[PDB]
Design a protein around this motif. Structure first.
Motif, mmCIF file in Angstrom:
data_model
loop_
_atom_site.group_PDB
_atom_site.id
_atom_site.type_symbol
_atom_site.label_atom_id
_atom_site.label_comp_id
_atom_site.label_asym_id
_atom_site.label_seq_id
_atom_site.Cartn_x
_atom_site.Cartn_y
_atom_site.Cartn_z
ATOM 1 N N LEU A 121 -17.834 -34.421 -25.208
ATOM 2 C CA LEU A 121 -18.119 -32.976 -25.287
ATOM 3 C C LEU A 121 -17.504 -32.207 -24.107
ATOM 4 O O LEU A 121 -17.961 -31.111 -23.752
ATOM 5 N N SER A 122 -16.481 -32.795 -23.495
ATOM 6 C CA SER A 122 -15.827 -32.187 -22.342
ATOM 7 C C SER A 122 -15.108 -30.881 -22.701
ATOM 8 O O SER A 122 -14.651 -30.699 -23.837
ATOM 9 N N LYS A 123 -15.022 -29.977 -21.725
ATOM 10 C CA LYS A 123 -14.278 -28.708 -21.851
ATOM 11 C C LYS A 123 -14.789 -27.817 -22.981
ATOM 12 O O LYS A 123 -14.020 -27.073 -23.587
ATOM 13 N N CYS A 124 -16.090 -27.891 -23.240
ATOM 14 C CA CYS A 124 -16.714 -27.113 -24.303
ATOM 15 C C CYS A 124 -17.392 -25.825 -23.828
ATOM 16 O O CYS A 124 -18.161 -25.208 -24.572
ATOM 17 N N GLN A 141 -23.366 -45.113 -26.063
ATOM 18 C CA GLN A 141 -22.942 -45.855 -24.861
ATOM 19 C C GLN A 141 -22.200 -45.015 -23.826
ATOM 20 O O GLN A 141 -22.314 -45.245 -22.609
ATOM 21 N N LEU A 142 -21.457 -44.030 -24.307
ATOM 22 C CA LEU A 142 -20.720 -43.149 -23.432
ATOM 23 C C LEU A 142 -20.908 -41.718 -23.871
ATOM 24 O O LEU A 142 -20.754 -41.393 -25.051
ATOM 25 N N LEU A 143 -21.238 -40.874 -22.904
ATOM 26 C CA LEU A 143 -21.411 -39.461 -23.113
ATOM 27 C C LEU A 143 -20.636 -38.705 -22.041
ATOM 28 O O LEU A 143 -20.953 -38.777 -20.854
ATOM 29 N N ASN A 144 -19.620 -37.979 -22.471
ATOM 30 C CA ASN A 144 -18.777 -37.245 -21.554
ATOM 31 C C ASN A 144 -19.068 -35.772 -21.712
ATOM 32 O O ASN A 144 -18.861 -35.195 -22.787
ATOM 33 N N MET A 145 -19.554 -35.161 -20.639
ATOM 34 C CA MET A 145 -19.794 -33.731 -20.646
ATOM 35 C C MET A 145 -19.162 -33.065 -19.440
ATOM 36 O O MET A 145 -19.655 -32.060 -18.941
ATOM 37 N N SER A 146 -18.059 -33.633 -18.979
ATOM 38 C CA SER A 146 -17.375 -33.124 -17.803
ATOM 39 C C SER A 146 -16.601 -31.841 -18.104
ATOM 40 O O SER A 146 -16.208 -31.606 -19.251
ATOM 41 N N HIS A 147 -16.371 -31.021 -17.072
ATOM 42 C CA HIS A 147 -15.544 -29.812 -17.195
ATOM 43 C C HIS A 147 -16.210 -28.793 -18.042
ATOM 44 O O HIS A 147 -15.546 -28.090 -18.809
ATOM 45 N N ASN A 148 -17.533 -28.719 -17.927
ATOM 46 C CA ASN A 148 -18.307 -27.615 -18.495
ATOM 47 C C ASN A 148 -18.823 -26.692 -17.377
ATOM 48 O O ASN A 148 -18.234 -26.666 -16.289
ATOM 49 N N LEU A 173 -22.222 -41.950 -18.213
ATOM 50 C CA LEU A 173 -22.519 -40.543 -18.363
ATOM 51 C C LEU A 173 -21.659 -39.748 -17.384
ATOM 52 O O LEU A 173 -21.826 -39.850 -16.172
ATOM 53 N N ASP A 174 -20.728 -38.974 -17.930
ATOM 54 C CA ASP A 174 -19.778 -38.217 -17.133
ATOM 55 C C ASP A 174 -20.089 -36.726 -17.095
ATOM 56 O O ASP A 174 -19.848 -36.017 -18.071
ATOM 57 N N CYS A 175 -20.595 -36.252 -15.964
ATOM 58 C CA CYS A 175 -20.862 -34.818 -15.791
ATOM 59 C C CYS A 175 -20.053 -34.185 -14.660
ATOM 60 O O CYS A 175 -20.437 -33.153 -14.105
HETATM 61 C C1 LIG Z 1 -14.212 -37.328 -19.646
HETATM 62 O O1 LIG Z 1 -13.322 -36.338 -20.102
HETATM 63 C C2 LIG Z 1 -12.285 -35.939 -19.213
HETATM 64 C C3 LIG Z 1 -11.290 -35.043 -19.941
HETATM 65 O O2 LIG Z 1 -11.922 -33.845 -20.321
HETATM 66 C C4 LIG Z 1 -11.500 -37.108 -18.637
HETATM 67 O O3 LIG Z 1 -10.803 -36.544 -17.543
HETATM 68 C C5 LIG Z 1 -9.581 -37.214 -17.183
HETATM 69 O O4 LIG Z 1 -9.857 -38.137 -16.152
HETATM 70 C C6 LIG Z 1 -8.753 -38.757 -15.523
HETATM 71 C C7 LIG Z 1 -9.309 -39.735 -14.497
HETATM 72 O O5 LIG Z 1 -9.520 -40.974 -15.135
HETATM 73 C C8 LIG Z 1 -7.882 -37.689 -14.872
HETATM 74 O O6 LIG Z 1 -6.781 -38.278 -14.219
HETATM 75 C C9 LIG Z 1 -7.401 -36.711 -15.939
HETATM 76 O O7 LIG Z 1 -6.736 -35.635 -15.320
HETATM 77 C C10 LIG Z 1 -8.558 -36.156 -16.771
HETATM 78 N N1 LIG Z 1 -8.038 -35.564 -17.981
HETATM 79 C C11 LIG Z 1 -8.018 -34.259 -18.265
HETATM 80 C C12 LIG Z 1 -8.563 -33.277 -17.260
HETATM 81 O O8 LIG Z 1 -7.561 -33.851 -19.335
HETATM 82 C C13 LIG Z 1 -12.445 -38.235 -18.197
HETATM 83 O O9 LIG Z 1 -11.721 -39.394 -17.864
HETATM 84 C C14 LIG Z 1 -13.456 -38.592 -19.281
HETATM 85 N N2 LIG Z 1 -14.425 -39.573 -18.812
HETATM 86 C C15 LIG Z 1 -14.508 -40.799 -19.310
HETATM 87 C C16 LIG Z 1 -15.561 -41.709 -18.737
HETATM 88 O O10 LIG Z 1 -13.759 -41.195 -20.196
#
Ligand SMILES: *[C@@H]1O[C@H](CO)[C@@H](O[C@@H]2O[C@H](CO)[C@@H](O)[C@H](O)[C@H]2NC(C)=O)[C@H](O)[C@H]1NC(C)=O
Ligand SMILES: *[C@@H]1O[C@H](CO)[C@@H](O[C@@H]2O[C@H](CO)[C@@H](O)[C@H](O)[C@H]2NC(C)=O)[C@H](O)[C@H]1NC(C)=O
Ligand code: NAG
Ligand code: NAG
Ligand code: NAG
Lengths: 581, 135, 581, 135
Positions: free
Chosen positions: C475-478, C495-502, C521-523
């Motif tokens: 759910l990243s960048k949402c 197992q994996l939940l990505n919510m980074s870049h919110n 869990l990626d926040c």
């Molecule tokens: C969660 O999502 C983000 C993308 O939105 C992933 O971000 C990337 O991470 C790597 C590091 O491994 C960076 O080098 C990249 O620049 C990022 N990509 C982008 C900003 O598009 C992140 O890896 C994901 N997390 C997991 C656990 O898979």
């Protein structure tokens, strides 16, 4: 029991159970709706008190009888609406007192004839609507001689079966009359030979008149001699339709001179009926709601100046190369279609909006074959891939991409050749601005609408250095969090700046110094806590500053800004409604 | 409840909206089979406003899960397809409208649909029907 | 000293002005790249101490001489790369010691002959690369019968001009051999009659061989008798090419039995080459970088089971009716074709990515004509209008729309039929989730990728209540700012939940307390200030909890949290680089 | 430093990237008319990696206004158009690559373009060029 909508001016008396005009209503009232009340009869002198009344709606008031001098005092009435009242017979003197009437609506009033309809003294009348009655004759009565301002008569949905030479004698004897005539939904089955010799009409509408192809052929044959500015032809989905529609039915229109031709919904359309030879000399061609699937016919000798295709069903973009077409409209088409190159030397106006249109290789001369395009609307479409920056289309002055997906627009200066452009809308195109030169070349630009996009790192960057002539700029919903230093310094002529619905933490006064002509600044729905950077620098021309729906931290640590509310009170909008957070 | 019909895959009924009760008799021949139907919508009323710019707001719910407001335009105001578009306030409308559709996969059980008819020129609500569909 | 990428396994020694094997550098490694050093002469026993070695690269090492027994103790080695050393002649016992060699690359070593090339002893050999040498004969030497694991010999870019029957005798008497032959860039102008009688080949690559279409024509005729699994034909853009390319050049092919056929770039190209009858019994047809403009006149008796169109120039989506086609790939097309209905009852695999395709009325049975579809890739395209919820396509397991412009997907339950779907990617489709039922029907789904979209009111809604089989959720960048209560409660197997870049301002334990299976869990890259709720209630299975790049608030009212950071630091990633804001 | 050519609308020249200087002799015939050119790019060199997955990162500036990174691929890894795609680390490369383009409108001025060559399989920098264009 009436609703007051505009005080002393407009009053809504619909759907009570009034048997009479309520007498507590102000004397100055300009507009009254009294429809759907059981009034049965209009007593003489009923509306005497309302000397300034302009609009009167009496639809569905069950009225059987109008008495003499019912309207006596109403010298200012311009609109009278009587729809749905069974006033079978109108006495002479029914309409006396209406000295300024311009619009008479007597739809479904069981009216049988125009000869006996006592409107000969309604000299001011512009519009006459007598649809859905019992009129059997097409005869334009001699009292139309008094009616020198009349421009439109609606004869729709009546019992007219024939048009004769005598029917249209009034028009024959008066070539100067600028009249339009809706004849739709009449069961016309015969037009006398030469009936239309010496007659001129502005607009003639003939929709849903015919049950038989043979009858339509032979009726349009005796339209011979008619000069119409706008002929509207076609049928309805919810009515008796033609079994077959051949181009040959149109034979007859060859002896009629037509400026503009409009074809509406047709049950049994064929692509070649707009290719028909008797339409060659028309100057405007229009299709609306027509099952046309392909347009790849059109001979070069055809004199069309405008083609308009609205809510049709093209499966492919039409191949066109008409030497004279100044104006092309293709809008609200079914499905998706992908743009195809056309060749239109005279083309100055192009509207291709609302088609889910695909466009690979936008946009240059070789796409359109014109050098004189001034207007290009590509809004509400699909993927538009920018490949070309408008070489050859430098006359362009209006460009609209709103709600379409623009692609590759930040990969170069996509608008470079557009030195004459006045208006540009790229709102809601999912563009991520990451190239400072995106607006290079737009030195004449006045209006820029770019709401609903984004910027690298959510910072507003130096993209406005060359857009000097900008008076209107919209940056709402751009997810902005930050503003670069000199970003507005050049915009000496800017009057309006919408930066609402962003994520601005605070303002900075130095950004808006140099905006000498700023009347309206809109910063609502941000996360603005306070403003910094010396408050004298806010433009002296600033009349409307919107700081509503923000998150102001009310304390004493930013007390400088909280003091700017006093002398600058009429300048902020919704001043006394703002709340701390 | 003003009307109902049963179909091989749906039972459809309607009532008037709670706070807007301008009368309309609307019915379909045949009863709509959600998996696909050819037929007519019979409509007999007297509109409380002009029909030139008639559109519908549809508020639909599937087992209490609601859809975003859906807007259906029927009369655009120009060279329209249906005769009734030209009907004025207070005029008798009596018409039967053809319709046809193939049928998407629908869930499940209980549908609510309020249909607001609106005159686009004035934004006045014309009539409002509360529909119930069991599929 | 040499650049060490891996501790005691791998060493980079590029351009390091070494003239010998580095003695003072650790004798422990498995992989060593020594390329671009001026060694000049390769001394014997040089690799005595290195015996853990698997991979060795000596490209352009100026090596003129390979001394007797130079590969002393190297018996684990499997990859030797000798490219660009001017060694010319190899004396007997050149490779004695190498007793486990799989891969030998002798490109540009001035190799004149295979006959005297001392690789007869190396029974373990798999792949032999002698391209860019001076081999004039295509002759396959008898010692190949000792080489009983040999599967690929590369003779590209040599001086081979003829192929005789006797050249290929080895294969004739040894039908049990599985060999593949790249013969590209050889000026072949004569092939002996019946040379290819009684010979099997796995793959044969013949690219850029012929200068005249006549020499090409006659050469292909003498392929007669060949059994090839895969045959690759064509030219290169940066080489000599045929002026005219008639399908009649291809007539020798119907006397060769071909399982799989590949055509690559061609200077000239006639669309009806794919219709050619000598290709009717091929099981896999491929065209890559080909100037095909249309594909519509394909016979129904053609036996193609897969068809792949890569980097070609289609002006229309192919019209296809092939009854045995199982797999269709059309990708990276030059233009912007729009989907056109197709009839493929055997089709289970469909890849239409990267064409800027427009698709109105996606998607159901009638678009494709199959009930067997398991894989649908529509990624990197233009506008895709959702109009049908996959009726007839409920065997779908993999569906990809990433980076395409989906429409109307929130207008209904667009995926309702897809009860067997395991993988779904709608990332970067510009979808705004407005409807809780958007994923209804998706009960098998494991992977949900939906990055780069948004939600109504920037709130994460209850869209996952019945996607119970989810193990991967992105759910990243949402643009998320809030999370409704209960949203994840159903996801016991996640197992994996990505919510980074919110834009989350904080976390709450209770959102995650039922995620009994959560490992990652990626926040990261939110604006997290702290977490609330019962901190010990975060899933016990949590291993990688990413909280970097936030804005933690080191205040005395976030103490329970700040304490928790220290105890749970084993699982927080890069905890030691985390700084207060 | 390395090469120079002039056209009716452009002057073009290059040197090696300051902190990456692996040898490549490259040349176009004719010199590039930015408005439209047909010709060959001549390239002679010994690459430092496998060309199987070769692409370029292009970093462009126009009068110091910089473009986003432009990633351009030359070898995809499967049935590639070009002879050089098959070349290995250490192997000599000597070829003439044809090119054609119809020409967009370019702001007049000073363009910088560093062209990094990447071996897509290893991500290693093969060579880097620093281009100057006056238009
Ligand atoms: C969660 O999502 C983000 C993308 O939105 C992933 O971000 C990337 O991470 C790597 C590091 O491994 C960076 O080098 C990249 O620049 C990022 N990509 C982008 C900003 O598009 C992140 O890896 C994901 N997390 C997991 C656990 O898979
Ligand atoms: C600033 O731009 C915003 C667009 O986000 C405008 O906001 C609209 O305001 C009108 C009232 O004039 C409301 O009815 C709408 O709710 C808003 N529209 C949308 C689409 O959100 C605002 O009008 C702009 N300011 C000015 C002066 O035009
Ligand atoms: C977001 C918002 O409400 N902005 C308002 C806008 O609607 C209005 O046009 C303007 C001047 O009237 O004041 C501000
Ligand atoms: C002109 O209108 C006047 C007004 O009373 C009327 O007397 C006269 O008869 C009208 N003319 C005709 C031709 O009816
Ligand atoms: C005639 O009347 C119409 C109104 O229907 C008007 O638009 C048109 O311009 C008129 N023509 C002239 C010459 O006045």
């Amino acid at each position: 029991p009436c609703i007051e909508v505009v005080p002393n001016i407009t009053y809504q008396c619909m759907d009570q159970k009034l048997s009479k005009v309520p007498d507590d209503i102000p004397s100055s009232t300009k507009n009254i709706d009294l429809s759907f009340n059981p009034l049965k009869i209009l007593k003489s002198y009923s509306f005497s008190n309302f000397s300034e009344l302009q609009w009167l709606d009496l639809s569905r008031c069950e009225i059987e009888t109008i008495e003499d001098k019912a309207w006596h005092g109403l010298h200012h009435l311009s609109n009278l609406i009587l729809t749905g009242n069974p006033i079978q017979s109108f006495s002479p003197g029914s309409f006396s007192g209406l000295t300024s009437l311009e619009n008479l609506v007597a739809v479904e009033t069981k009216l049988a004839s125009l000869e006996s309809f006592p409107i000969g003294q309604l000299i001011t009348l512009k519009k006459l609507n007598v649809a859905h009655n019992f009129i059997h004759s097409c005869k334009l009565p001699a009292y139309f001689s008094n009616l020198t301002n009349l421009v439109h008569v609606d004869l729709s949905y009546n019992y007219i079966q024939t048009i004769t030479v005598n029917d249209l004698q009034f028009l024959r004897e008066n070539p100067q009359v600028n009249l339009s005539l809706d004849m739709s939904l009449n069961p016309i089955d015969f037009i006398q030979d030469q009936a239309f010799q010496g007659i001129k009409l502005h607009e003639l509408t003939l929709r849903g008149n015919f049950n038989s192809s043979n009858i339509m052929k032979t009726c349009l044959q005796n339209l011979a001699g008619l000069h119409v500015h706008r002929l509207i032809l076609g049928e309805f989905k919810d009515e008796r339709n033609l079994e077959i529609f051949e181009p040959s039915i149109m034979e007859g229109l060859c002896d009629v001179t037509i400026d503009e031709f409009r074809l509406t919904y047709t049950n049994d359309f064929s692509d070649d009926i707009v290719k028909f030879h008797c339409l060659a000399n028309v100057s405007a061609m229009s299709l609306a709601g027509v099952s046309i699937k392909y347009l790849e016919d059109v001979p070069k000798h055809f004199k069309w100046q405008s083609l308009s295709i609205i809510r049709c069903q093209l499966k492919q973009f039409p191949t066109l190369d008409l030497p004279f077409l100044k104006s092309l409209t293709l809008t609200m088409n079914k499905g998706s279609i992908s743009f195809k190159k056309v060749a239109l030397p005279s083309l100055s106006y192009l509207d291709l909006s609302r088609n889910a249109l695909s466009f690979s290789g936008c946009c240059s001369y070789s796409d359109l074959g014109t050098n004189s395009l001034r207007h290009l609307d590509l809004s509400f479409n699909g993927a538009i891939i920018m490949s070309a920056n408008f070489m050859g289309l430098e006359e362009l002055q209006h460009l609209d991409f709103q709600h379409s997906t623009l692609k590759r627009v930040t990969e170069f200066s996509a608008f470079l050749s557009l030195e004459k452009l006045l208006y540009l809308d790229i709102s809601y195109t999912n563009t991520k601005i990451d190239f400072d030169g995106i607006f290079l070349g737009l030195t004449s630009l006045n209006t820029l609408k770019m709401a609903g996009n984004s910027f690298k790192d959510n910072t507003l960057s130096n993209v406005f250095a060359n857009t000097t002539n900008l008076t209107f700029l919209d940056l709402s919903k751009c997810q902005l969090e930050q503003i670069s230093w000199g970003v507005f310094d050049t915009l000496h002529r800017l009057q309006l700046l919408n930066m609402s619905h962003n994520n601005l933490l605070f303002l900075d006064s130095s950004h808006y110094n140099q905006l000498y002509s700023l009347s309206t600044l809109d910063c609502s729905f941000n996360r603005i806590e306070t403003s910094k950077g010396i408050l004298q620098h806010f433009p002296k021309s600033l009349a409307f500053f919107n700081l509503t729906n923000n998150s102001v931290a009310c304390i004493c640590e930013h007390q400088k800004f909280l003091q700017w509310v006093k002398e600058q009170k009429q300048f902020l909008v919704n001043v006394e409604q703002m709340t701390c957070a | 409840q003003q009307w109902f019909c049963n179909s091989s895959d749906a039972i459809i009924s309607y009532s008037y909206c709670d706070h807007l009760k301008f009368p309309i008799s609307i019915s379909s021949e045949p009863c709509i089979r959600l998996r696909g139907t050819n037929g007519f919508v019979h409509v007999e009323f007297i509109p409380r406003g002009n029909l030139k710019y008639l559109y519908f707001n549809l508020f639909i719910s599937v087992n209490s899960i609601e859809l975003p407001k859906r807007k259906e335009v029927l009369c655009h105001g120009h060279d329209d397809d249906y005769s009734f578009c030209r009907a004025l306030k207070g005029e008798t409308v009596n018409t039967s409208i053809p319709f046809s559709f193939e049928g998407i996969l629908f869930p499940k059980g209980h549908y609510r649909c309020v249909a607001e008819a609106i005159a686009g020129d004035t934004e006045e609500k014309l009539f409002c029907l509360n529909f119930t569909i069991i599929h």
